[PDB]
Design a protein around this ligand. Structure first.
Ligand SMILES: *[C@@H]1O[C@H](CO)[C@@H](O[C@@H]2O[C@H](CO)[C@@H](O[C@@H]3O[C@H](CO[C@H]4O[C@H](CO)[C@@H](O)[C@H](O[C@H]5O[C@H](CO)[C@@H](O)[C@H](O)[C@@H]5O)[C@@H]4O)[C@@H](O)[C@H](O[C@H]4O[C@H](CO)[C@@H](O)[C@H](O)[C@@H]4O)[C@@H]3O)[C@H](O)[C@H]2NC(C)=O)[C@H](O)[C@H]1NC(C)=O
Ligand SMILES: *[C@@H]1O[C@H](CO)[C@@H](O[C@@H]2O[C@H](CO)[C@@H](O[C@@H]3O[C@H](CO[C@H]4O[C@H](CO)[C@@H](O)[C@H](O[C@H]5O[C@H](CO)[C@@H](O)[C@H](O)[C@@H]5O)[C@@H]4O)[C@@H](O)[C@H](O[C@H]4O[C@H](CO)[C@@H](O)[C@H](O)[C@@H]4O)[C@@H]3O)[C@H](O)[C@H]2NC(C)=O)[C@H](O)[C@H]1NC(C)=O
Ligand SMILES: *[C@@H]1O[C@H](CO)[C@@H](O[C@@H]2O[C@H](CO)[C@@H](O[C@@H]3O[C@H](CO[C@H]4O[C@H](CO)[C@@H](O)[C@H](O[C@H]5O[C@H](CO)[C@@H](O)[C@H](O)[C@@H]5O)[C@@H]4O)[C@@H](O)[C@H](O[C@H]4O[C@H](CO)[C@@H](O)[C@H](O)[C@@H]4O)[C@@H]3O)[C@H](O)[C@H]2NC(C)=O)[C@H](O)[C@H]1NC(C)=O
Ligand SMILES: *[C@@H]1O[C@H](CO)[C@@H](O)[C@H](O)[C@H]1NC(C)=O
Ligand SMILES: *[C@@H]1O[C@H](CO)[C@@H](O)[C@H](O)[C@H]1NC(C)=O
Ligand SMILES: *[C@@H]1O[C@H](CO)[C@@H](O)[C@H](O)[C@H]1NC(C)=O
Ligand SMILES: *[C@@H]1O[C@H](CO)[C@@H](O)[C@H](O)[C@H]1NC(C)=O
Ligand SMILES: *[C@@H]1O[C@H](CO)[C@@H](O)[C@H](O)[C@H]1NC(C)=O
Ligand SMILES: *[C@@H]1O[C@H](CO)[C@@H](O)[C@H](O)[C@H]1NC(C)=O
Ligand SMILES: *[C@@H]1O[C@H](CO)[C@@H](O)[C@H](O)[C@H]1NC(C)=O
Ligand SMILES: *[C@@H]1O[C@H](CO)[C@@H](O)[C@H](O)[C@H]1NC(C)=O
Lengths: 105, 128, 133, 133, 133
């Protein structure tokens, strides 16, 4: 129910921008948005939480933004290891991670 | 630091009920929640639930409300800030449509608005 | 409300323990530590009395030369050199306890005490020049 | 002018004694209280010396956690609960002496010392949040 | 830079020594001055410990009743009576050392300590009247 971008790509040095949106049930003003980098069938990785706060160690080229109707995730200056699938999650302080559909980058 | 070694790659058939083990090291097991996540093939990733290794409190999705038993046993002090814990996962009216990889991940922070957020994950376990 | 007691939040997060500082502050010169007899117990109690006022005045002298007299929480003008700790605000105040924080900040605590010291001496030099008109 | 001396206005009105506070302030750590010999008189004088700095530092520690460091007259943010004393301003400062005032306010003096304590800790928490921008 | 050390600028000009006050400030309660044994050396060390906190608290009490708590350089409202010293600013701060200055200002240092004392008590009386509205 939390629709992401279908798919998209770029080139080394360029940037991308994944989307994440949905109804009033899971988006956006009264919810937080986290961004997990999730290679298929492996240990995931937290990139950004609370709409735009990067997890410790995350490269600054990963960035988060949230409009009043859709949350974004820009991945600047691409590199080889970026070819993974990315999922957004909506959550509050006492709930669960409503994950997103998916986006192949 | 922090590690969360998971159990083996179990293989059963519908109707049964299997237990998944998550064993932690390098951090205080009581200070962060333990989350259970499922990555099925015929669906998007599903957050199953988290449980409090300190308060014993548990919270899971309605898609698992009366089907899953989440439990943890008390930690073992190693140093002032390092302990070893364990978290257990069970499913009731289990079929074969619940097949996939299962992950355990601990919480993010000890306070704030993203306390329970799955931050440090395990290596996963293949199932039926 | 809560009120855990003296050192009651030693295991809590730095942000949570930082709200109950008066709890530890008042127990730094009291305890239960009238004639002065020099018996085996009397000498022991005299040392306990002199020691408490000594260690109390050392901390107050540091707060003085930093410009933080009478403050439990004072802000400064020493910027946080990230080589002391590259941790972020949330992963400190909502994650670490003061004990494990003191463990990793312990190497540079002498460097910080010097920068706070000269920041206050230069600050008091500027305030005098500004009031010279 | 007047200058009654140490405790000279102990029988005067609270408003009149309140103008000569420095008179009592300076005599709280001096008196006449160089080698340390442990004779019968020498032990006596050592106890007199340690005791004065002890009772002096207890009062200064209270002034500290109240936000009244270095003040003889500091104002606060604890409102006067009339169940402490329903007397009016004029019938206090122009009528009562500090001795008879301390006599009737003595029951609640511990309650007041706690409200002053947490008023300062919450105040120092607000000043930090205001300077966070 | 420079950093001459403890008392390193005792022969320097008053204006030059006045920039390195923290150097002398921190060495007023430390030195190297755990059981309390009353041996010939043990009594000696106990006197050295009590004495340092005594002379330290006397100076801090003066800074308190002057309104200069926690300050190395505080400005006042006592005007400079030229009968204390008719020297000019430049021939003091760029000429005299604090030692030879203290030599000629020594007679009136008690007069100055009283004017500073009552200036602060009247000042704290005014601040209360201003906050009475
Ligand atoms: C010792 O160490 C432990 C482990 O770290 C500490 O326990 C953790 O404390 C932190 C903060 O104190 C907790 O974070 C909070 O999490 C809650 C989420 O829980 C809420 O939701 C539950 C599921 O929906 C619900 O069951 C709860 O409701 C009651 O039920 C339980 C049953 O046991 C009861 O124990 C609860 O107390 C409730 O009465 C519960 O409401 C979340 O709501 C908090 O967010 C709010 O507050 C923060 C500020 O703290 C604010 O920023 C937010 O915006 C929001 O307003 C907060 O995130 C954490 O859950 C605890 N448990 C862990 C980490 O496992 C313990 O506090 C330490 N004690 C000491 C003395 O050191
Ligand atoms: C000990 O305790 C006693 C008893 O309480 C105290 O004595 C009282 O002190 C208060 C204040 O100090 C006095 O209140 C003042 O009253 C005067 C009225 O007296 C004036 O009028 C007299 C009649 O007209 C006149 O004779 C006086 O003139 C001189 O003569 C007498 C002769 O003995 C001499 O003693 C006087 O000193 C005079 O030199 C006198 O002028 C009144 O003027 C005062 O009001 C002014 O001041 C107040 C501020 O205080 C101000 O608010 C007003 O607006 C106004 O400007 C003031 O009300 C009281 O009269 C005293 N006697 C009592 C109560 O019986 C004594 O002070 C205490 N001492 C100590 C050390 O504790
Ligand atoms: C102990 O006591 C002695 C004696 O009083 C002190 O020595 C005196 O110190 C004061 C200030 O510290 C000096 O005043 C300064 O004078 C210089 C002039 O010298 C400059 O010009 C020289 C000739 O052109 C030149 O050779 C110098 O250049 C270098 O060479 C010498 C060679 O030995 C070397 O020693 C120098 O250090 C230089 O490296 C020198 O540049 C003048 O420039 C100063 O004015 C500037 O600074 C003041 C502020 O201080 C400012 O107000 C001005 O506007 C300007 O910016 C200043 O007037 C004095 O010359 C010293 N000698 C005397 C008086 O004989 C000594 O400091 C004391 N030490 C301690 C620890 O107490
Ligand atoms: C989970 O399993 C334990 C096994 O000891 C059992 O005691 C407990 O009741 C189970 N949880 C629920 C909710 O039934
Ligand atoms: C941090 O401190 C080191 C020495 O401890 C210094 O070399 C460096 O310049 C400092 N960095 C900043 C940003 O102040
Ligand atoms: C919390 O503090 C511990 C202390 O070692 C650290 O290992 C951990 O990474 C911190 N948590 C986060 C989310 O940074
Ligand atoms: C502090 O110094 C010791 C010296 O052996 C070193 O081992 C340790 O890693 C240092 N810690 C930090 C945080 O710099
Ligand atoms: C006064 O104090 C009592 C308890 O001592 C309290 O119940 C009451 O509410 C207080 N009144 C006011 C006006 O603060
Ligand atoms: C203080 O407490 C005592 C207890 O016996 C009581 O008798 C007295 O009246 C109280 N005084 C006030 C002012 O409350
Ligand atoms: C200086 O002090 C004397 C007494 O020491 C005094 O008589 C004189 O009026 C004072 N002068 C000034 C200008 O204050
Ligand atoms: C200080 O007093 C002594 C008293 O003998 C006098 O000789 C000296 O000149 C006085 N000095 C000053 C600066 O007034």
């Amino acid at each position: 129910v939390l629709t992401q971008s279908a798919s998209v790509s770029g080139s080394l040095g360029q940037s991308v921008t994944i989307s994440c949106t949905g109804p009033n049930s899971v988006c956006c003003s009264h919810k937080s948005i986290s961004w997990y980098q999730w290679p298929p069938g492996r240990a995931p990785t937290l990139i950004i939480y609370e709409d735009n706060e990067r997890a410790p160690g995350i490269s600054p080229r990963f960035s988060g933004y949230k409009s009043y109707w859709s949350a974004y995730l820009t991945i600047s200056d691409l590199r080889p290891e970026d070819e993974t699938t990315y999922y957004c999650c909506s959550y509050t302080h006492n709930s669960g991670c409503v994950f997103g559909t998916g986006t192949k980058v | 630091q922090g590690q969360l070694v998971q159990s083996g790659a179990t293989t059963t058939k519908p109707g049964s009920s299997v237990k998944i083990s998550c064993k932690t090291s390098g951090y205080r097991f009581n200070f962060y929640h333990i989350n259970w996540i499922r990555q099925t093939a015929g669906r998007g990733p599903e957050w199953m639930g988290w449980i409090s290794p300190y308060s014993g409190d548990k919270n899971l999705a309605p898609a698992f409300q009366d089907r899953v038993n989440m439990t943890t046993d008390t930690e073992v002090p190693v140093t002032s800030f390092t302990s070893t814990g364990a978290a257990y996962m069970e499913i009731r009216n289990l079929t074969s449509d619940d097949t996939g990889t299962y992950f355990c991940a601990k919480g993010l922070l000890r306070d704030g608005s993203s306390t329970w957020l799955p931050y440090l994950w395990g290596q996963g376990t293949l199932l039926t | 409300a809560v009120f855990l007691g003296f050192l009651g939040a030693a295991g809590s997060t730095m942000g949570a323990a930082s709200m109950t500082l008066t709890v530890q502050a008042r127990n730094l010169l009291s305890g239960i530590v009238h004639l002065l007899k020099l018996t085996v117990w009397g000498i022991k109690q005299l040392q306990a009395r002199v020691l408490a006022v000594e260690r109390y005045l050392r901390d107050q002298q540091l707060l003085g030369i930093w410009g933080c007299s009478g403050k439990l929480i004072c802000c400064t003008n020493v910027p946080w050199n990230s080589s002391w700790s590259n941790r972020n605000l949330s992963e400190i105040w909502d994650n670490m306890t003061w004990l494990q924080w003191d463990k990793e900040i312990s190497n540079y605590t002498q460097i910080i005490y010097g920068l706070l010291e000269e920041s206050q001496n230069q600050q008091e030099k500027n305030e005098q020049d500004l009031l010279a008109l």
